[PDB]
Subunit: 146 residues, 3 copies
């Protein structure tokens, strides 16, 4: 996946960013079976005060997670995954769940490219990976936080 | 909704950001009935010169509004809403409409979370809000301008 | 289109940003026929270390292209266009294709506004361009780099 994570500048320490990235990655792998290394978490920082809720300028606590997924999973699974992101990002970032917004968008795998390659359909990641070139597999394997 | 608003650094003062956020929020509230506090406007600033049109580097005037919505509204209404965003942001930002781009993306409400809670179907925002806890209601209430 | 291009701060010089924007623009016009000036490339820079892959903090090389398109094109065409972006951004940015991610999202043209106007359906950009104003056409034609 690509998870775009919109946070205020300096709200998350580097270690908190790492914990939030791990929380999202583990949740995605845990519920979908996709390999760790396909989960991209891309932090987008902006100065505090760039978020407005109902026209009211916010402090730095809002977190918006925009997850970009392949089509093909059930509404039930996507609900479980969104809830798990809310719960686990809240713990990892020490931010109340009321600050956390999570939207999932989906596209056909045929118009999605990770690491320069088109993605397979959900659940087919194992044989897709095994058929990648040796150097591609090796590069991908470096991106696993156990 | 979440309205991602891509603008050049320094092109909007704090009051202009507030005015643009209110223009978008009031448009969405007025045309959809959704509660004031559910409209997030999230300003994403980048240095001027990071926008290219037809390969030509731009100054700092372009505004791209990426609105992320629940599925369920009519094409008629979404068109009214996009037009009203163009008209009212042009006034609020003192920018000519030729500089304004507005795209709406839609997702099933079942994979959309505001304030840590899954959204209802559009017209059902009152009863959704009333089944919410007292503390959750109170926190949302604080996010209503004026 | 709008192509949101997520890169690390200082990985692309002003010259490389221009070259990447032209590569993306030329790919889109070449395969879709849409005029040059409707291709927006919007660079989003963040500090290196803000990207994680599999939980591992990355350096500054990842490039994510999020393309926002009208509905209406074939899966074949979208696949050719995504591959061409990978290939041509790899050349323009001097970056291995393994670093390049490209996702296309699509919406009805009826909820998409470029230059303050609603877009036509794919393939009908000529008639759409012909039917508004002289000032608008002039402004769009300033946004054409062919070199």
């Amino acid at each position: 996946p690509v998870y775009m994570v919109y946070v205020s500048q300096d709200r998350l320490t580097p270690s908190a960013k790492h914990a939030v990235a791990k929380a999202i990655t583990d949740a995605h792998r845990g519920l979908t079976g996709t390999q760790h290394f396909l989960a991209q978490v891309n932090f987008q920082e902006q100065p505090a005060g760039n978020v407005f809720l109902g026209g009211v300028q916010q402090g730095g606590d809002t977190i918006f997670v925009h997850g970009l997924h392949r089509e093909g999973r059930s509404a039930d699974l996507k609900g479980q995954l969104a809830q798990r992101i809310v719960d686990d990002v809240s713990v990892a970032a020490e931010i109340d769940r009321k600050h956390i917004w999570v939207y999932f968008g989906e596209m056909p795998a045929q118009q999605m490219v990770d690491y320069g390659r088109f993605l397979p359909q959900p659940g087919h990641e194992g044989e897709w990976f095994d058929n990648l070139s040796s150097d591609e597999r090796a590069f991908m394997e470096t991106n696993v936080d156990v």
